[PDB]
RNA sequence: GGGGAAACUCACGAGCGCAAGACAGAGAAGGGAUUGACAGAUUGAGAGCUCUUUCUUGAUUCUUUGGGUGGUGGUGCAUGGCCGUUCUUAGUUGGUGGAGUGAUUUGUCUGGUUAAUUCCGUUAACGAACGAGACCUUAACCUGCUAACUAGUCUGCUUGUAAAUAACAGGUUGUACUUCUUAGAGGGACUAUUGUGCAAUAAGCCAAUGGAAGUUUAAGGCAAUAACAGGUCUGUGAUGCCCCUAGACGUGCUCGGCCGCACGCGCGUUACAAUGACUGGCGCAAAAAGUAUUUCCUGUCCUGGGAAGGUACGGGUAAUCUUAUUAAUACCAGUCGUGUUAGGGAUAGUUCUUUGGAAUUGUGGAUCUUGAACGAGGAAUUUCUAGUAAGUGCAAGUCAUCAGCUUGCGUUGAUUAU
Ligand SMILES: [Mg+2]
Ligand SMILES: [Mg+2]
Ligand SMILES: [Mg+2]
Ligand SMILES: [Mg+2]
Ligand SMILES: [Mg+2]
Ligand SMILES: [Mg+2]
Ligand SMILES: [Mg+2]
Ligand SMILES: [Mg+2]
Ligand SMILES: [Mg+2]
């Protein structure tokens with residue numbers, strides 16, 4: 001079967017899931033089979049470019065990384081991509097490099113943001129009856 | 144007269160305990176016999192029927208609701224066998240709420 | 252809201268009472284010790300008891 | 316196969332079948348203490364176990380009520396004679412069954428036997444059979460044209476929590492009088508039975524009970540090098 | 544009051560039909576009780592309803608005298624059951640001791656502490672029961688376990704566009720695999736670690752660090768003692784008593800009515816625009832449903848400018864099919880330019896379509912028109928602390944058709960207090 005040089009990490013925010021696969025070579029980032037350039041709301045593309053600029057391109061020119069994302073809505077999706085990418089490099093440096101590098105990129109990243117290696121525990125709240133939402137309730141008449 | 148027959152066992156139950164009893168003694172029993180190959184328990188997603196009902200039989204003013212659930216657990220087990228072995232592995236007592244469905248695809 | 256209840260403190264008293272020689276400053280040890288030693292119907296319960304009992308081990312190390 | 320039915324729609328239909336049976340049996344079986352019904356379903360058959368206090372009246376005089384019942388289910392659903400099977404199973408402990416006991420006080424109250432005495436008789440019976448605790452509620456006109464509600468407790472009782480659904484057994488009956496409907500609930504908290512060995516009580520202990528188990532001193536022989 | 548009522552529902556109203564008036568006593572009936580019905584009138588009505596007209600039919604019974612069914616008729620102050628509310632507040636009991644002749648009291652408390660009569664401690668009280676807690680359900684952690692063609696990954700083959708061991712896409716594949724996805728076992732959190740932080744160093748609180756998670760993790764379910772003549776005879780083949788009983792308050796049919804408008808009071812949808820409206824472009828959800836075989840979800844395909852129609856090819860009683868999609872805020876262009884303006888669309892008039900025997904008193908939907916109030920709201924006053932408010936769509940219940948409601952589901956995501 002010839003076990004590949006693959007590493008596979010996942011990333012999560014709300015209902016969104018990102019699976020990033022990392023293999024060695026000339027660095028690509030393709031999300032859902034397309035460059036980061038084309039990710040829908042333009043503003044938060046820099047969110048995905050963050051861990052890249054934080055680690056420096058030097059780590060990323062050595063690796064082709066492809067991230068498929070399926071999930072909730074645009075923003076959470078962006079955060080999932082973020083996450084998967086970030087802990088993806090870490091997993092690579094775990095298997096194929098020394099542990100030391102894994103450690104120092106871990107620290108490197110988390111000093112900037114912890115949302116990269118750790119998932120946002122928040123999810124939606126179910127709705128309580130007698131309201132238009134998960135707390136707020138039908139208006140009341142006292143007098 | 145060799146028969147290679149793929150057997151599909153689908154278990155459905157409103158109680159979980161019952162169905163895991165069934166499942167796990169089918170797996171236990173099938174492995175215990177040499178002619179047998181077991182594609183293991185396949186756990187379908189759990190079906191939850193909800194019925195939300197207003198409590199008071201009247202309009203009596205506070206609105207209270209009842210969240211009434213019925214869970215249906217569905218399992219699949221696959222076997223590589225002949226007829227008699229099947230009838231051997233199905234030979235044990237099962238709790239009442241269990242549905243057992245058997246299908247046979249011939250294989251050459 | 253972290254105030255601990257009757258059941259838990261009675262429990263912890265007993266667990267130390269009989270077992271003090273077996274017991275450690277480590278929660279994770281004492282919880283397993285408890286589990287072996289006793290009938291505790293809940294994971295959550297056992298853990299609360301073990302934590303308080305640990306707490307009391309530490310309080311015992313200091314004095315009466 | 317017969318018809319391909321919605322696992323959801325089938326299962327709900329099975330539950331509704333079960334409930335129709337329970338209403339049918341509690342209604343037509345009203346004299347012998349009727350507790351429960353257990354239904355196994357075979358492609359061949361449908362097996363119904365009627366769990367009851369007085370199986371003898373389920374059968375009747377050489378299957379008068381049995382044959383009647385079996386044929387009732389037959390005409391009702393339509394069934395082959397090999398397709399339906401009815402068993403009656405005894406409840407070994409009558410004191411642990413609510414529906415039974417409420418039937419008991421139904422009976423005693425019909426004979427004009429006074430309230431407190433009857434309530435006491437059953438309660439004493441229930442605890443005599445090992446139930447930790449019991450309570451009875453009688454509501455409606457007792458004294459006068461103005462409704463009263465009388466409670467009788469003895470022993471140990473839980474109301475709130477998931478343990479409620481486990482340890483507490485409840486039944487109600489409507490009791491008929493010239494004056495109207497009066498009504499009666501029986502709550503028997505069952506005991507805790509640690510072994511599958513018997514049909515008793517509750518298999519899983521109250522989440523409250525916490526027990527420390529003091530150490531033992533036993534036989535110790537060592538193995539030591541001899542000295543000469 | 545699942546109280547979204549076109550018929551039905553349905554109790555209301557106008558006009559018509561049946562008996563499903565059992566059972567017993569008396570008389571009548573076989574030489575006839577009674578049923579039915581062409582046709583002409585009649586009627587709203589092919590209601591034989593009535594009237595004329597006779598032919599059928601063969602005890603299924605008719606007239607009285609009793610009397611039962613049946614009753615969405617009355618009575619919740621006759622009642623069960625259930626359900627609201629005090630109240631999710633923290634309360635409430637008893638035994639044995641102590642105090643009062645006694646009703647009663649201590650227990651059940653000065654004080655800390657907790658969300659909690661939660662605990663600590665005080666202690667003539669000691670021990671206990673209910674309630675709180677425990678518990679249970681959902682959500683959040685596992686690159687470890689158990690496995691999966693009704694999930695996916697990879698591996699090796701291939702296909703297309705390309706110079707292609709590039710890139711992006713398909714199709715296949717296996718004694719392959721578990722990250723993603725199901726979901727079973729077991730872990731995990733105990734307020735953990737630290738703290739010359741506050742605590743009379745006791746319960747506990749606080750902070751920092753670690754942590755998936757430290758508001759009782761979050762959101763719920765359950766809810767003692769006692770009440771309140773709270774609500775419910777219209778949910779019940781649970782009923783007491785009262786009433787209606789053949790032009791009936793029984794069971795049907797036809798047309799209305801509950802939607803009737805000078806007004807008063809509640810929930811609410813939509814707006815008063817530039818953080819906007821409109822015209823394009825854009826492979827972002829979750830959770831629910833689904834066929835007693837053509838009827839239920841519906842995917843292709845075709846016709847129509849459109850709502851919608853074909854029936855041409857098909858799948859799915861469903862992790863297989865509708866679909867792992869088809870949502871809408873959001874984003875990118877472009878128009879429009881602070882004025883009752885395209886903001887805002889109420890109200891109206893033609894046309895077309897769909898559900899239904901039935902749409903008139905517009906069931907919904909489509910196309911042109913028509914375009915009102917409203918320029919951010921008096922006295923008052925509601926709900927709400929984090930994936931929370933708010934905006935934003937989606938489903939489910941209802942349901943042939945009808946969501947401005949309800950019950951849920953995610954998306955975008957705050958201000959301000961702990
Ligand atoms: Mg909304
Ligand atoms: Mg109305
Ligand atoms: Mg009556
Ligand atoms: Mg009527
Ligand atoms: Mg006393
Ligand atoms: Mg005394
Ligand atoms: Mg005295
Ligand atoms: Mg007091
Ligand atoms: Mg005490």
Ligand SMILES: [Mg+2]
Pocket residue numbers: none
């Ligand atoms: Mg809670």
Ligand SMILES: [Mg+2]
Pocket residue numbers: none
């Ligand atoms: Mg009143």
Ligand SMILES: [Mg+2]
Pocket residue numbers: none
């Ligand atoms: Mg069509």
Ligand SMILES: [Mg+2]
Pocket residue numbers: none
């Ligand atoms: Mg759909």
Ligand SMILES: [Mg+2]
Pocket residue numbers: 905
């Ligand atoms: Mg019109």
Ligand SMILES: [Mg+2]
Pocket residue numbers: none
């Ligand atoms: Mg309209």
Ligand SMILES: [Mg+2]
Pocket residue numbers: none
């Ligand atoms: Mg529909």
Ligand SMILES: [Mg+2]
Pocket residue numbers: 948949
């Ligand atoms: Mg409604």
